[PDB]
């Protein structure tokens, strides 16, 4: 049938979305988030608790860009409304990992017996909690939460040995 490129994003109540200049800004009960979403040939309008993203043209690049921008807007509104949570587990064989939070970084001491602790960077206002053997990562930005989890998982990489024997590290069990 008729192919429509335009996409619609509902604005939940309590959420104010604005697109002054070429920057999206969503304010919600859980916080405020700001992203840059500018692409020539793509137009974004905000109106009556509903954002519409359309492409002037209809080629595959414009279809992909309207899809990506609509998904980003949806993720921003979901972050400002209900947020995002990511679950990671701590597993080790012989050395008990000492995992803690020292502010905007996560300290991972005794990783595989190392005398120098690993440092994992925290992104944005992302709250990381080490609840014993697991890590919860809550935030208002899916980008920030996913990157914090990725930073943890990559800092806990065993870059030398056979992965089928050495499996120590911190691994995401649930994405944002």
């Amino acid at each position: 049938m008729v192919k429509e490129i335009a996409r619609t994003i509902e604005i939940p109540e309590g959420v104010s979305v604005s697109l002054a200049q070429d920057v999206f800004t969503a304010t919600g009960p859980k916080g405020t988030v700001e992203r840059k979403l500018w692409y020539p040939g793509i137009m974004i309008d905000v109106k009556d608790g509903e954002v519409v993203v359309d492409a002037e043209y209809a080629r595959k690049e414009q279809k992909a860009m309207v899809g990506t921008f609509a998904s980003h807007i949806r993720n921003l509104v979901k972050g400002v409304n209900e947020g995002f949570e990511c679950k990671m587990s701590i597993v080790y064989a012989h050395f008990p990992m000492q995992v803690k939070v020292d502010g905007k970084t996560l300290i991972i001491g005794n990783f595989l017996g190392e005398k120098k602790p690993r440092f994992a960077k925290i992104i944005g206002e992302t709250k990381v909690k080490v609840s014993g053997n697991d890590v919860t990562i809550t935030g208002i930005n899916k980008e920030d939460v996913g990157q914090t989890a990725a930073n943890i998982e990559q800092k806990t990489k065993i870059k030398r040995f056979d992965p089928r024997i050495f499996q120590d590290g911190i691994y995401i069990v649930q994405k944002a």
Binding site: W38, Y39, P40, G41
Partner: protein, 138 residues
């Protein structure tokens, strides 16, 4: 006094060079760091580091580093600068990073056909980015 912000580098250079060769004015260009170079950032950086590190730089080509001096070089490449006419043209041209204090508050102009919003994509970088990735302090 031309404001180079959001202007295509080569098209601004061509316009200014042809004006200088028409030869009735002194041209000042400000915010040379804010000029635009279309194309992918990786490709532009690759070509510009190649040009910067190319020559027999002890006794060969000496490609500049500051964005204003790079823009001056770009205009120089579009002039008969070995001739008396091109020498006068380059002598009548001054390029600045940002706005110099003496030209502060002066009335500027912009080339409508050099505007960057006529580009069809987002594949571009700024001359200031190129200069600072080549290691210029400005």
């Amino acid at each position: 006094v031309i404001d180079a912000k959001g202007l295509i580098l080569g098209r601004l250079a061509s316009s200014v060079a042809k004006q200088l060769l028409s030869g009735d004015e002194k041209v000042y260009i400000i915010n040379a760091e804010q000029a635009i170079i279309s194309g992918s950032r990786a490709a532009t950086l690759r070509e510009y580091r190649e040009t910067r590190e190319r020559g027999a730089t002890e006794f060969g080509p000496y490609f500049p580093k500051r964005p204003d001096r790079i823009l001056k070089r770009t205009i120089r490449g579009m002039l008969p600068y070995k001739r008396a006419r091109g020498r006068d043209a380059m002598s009548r041209l001054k390029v600045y990073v940002g706005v110099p204090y003496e030209l502060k508050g002066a009335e500027t102009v912009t080339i409508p056909d050099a505007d960057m919003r006529l580009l069809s994509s987002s594949r571009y970088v700024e001359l200031g980015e190129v200069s600072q990735k080549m290691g210029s302090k400005f």
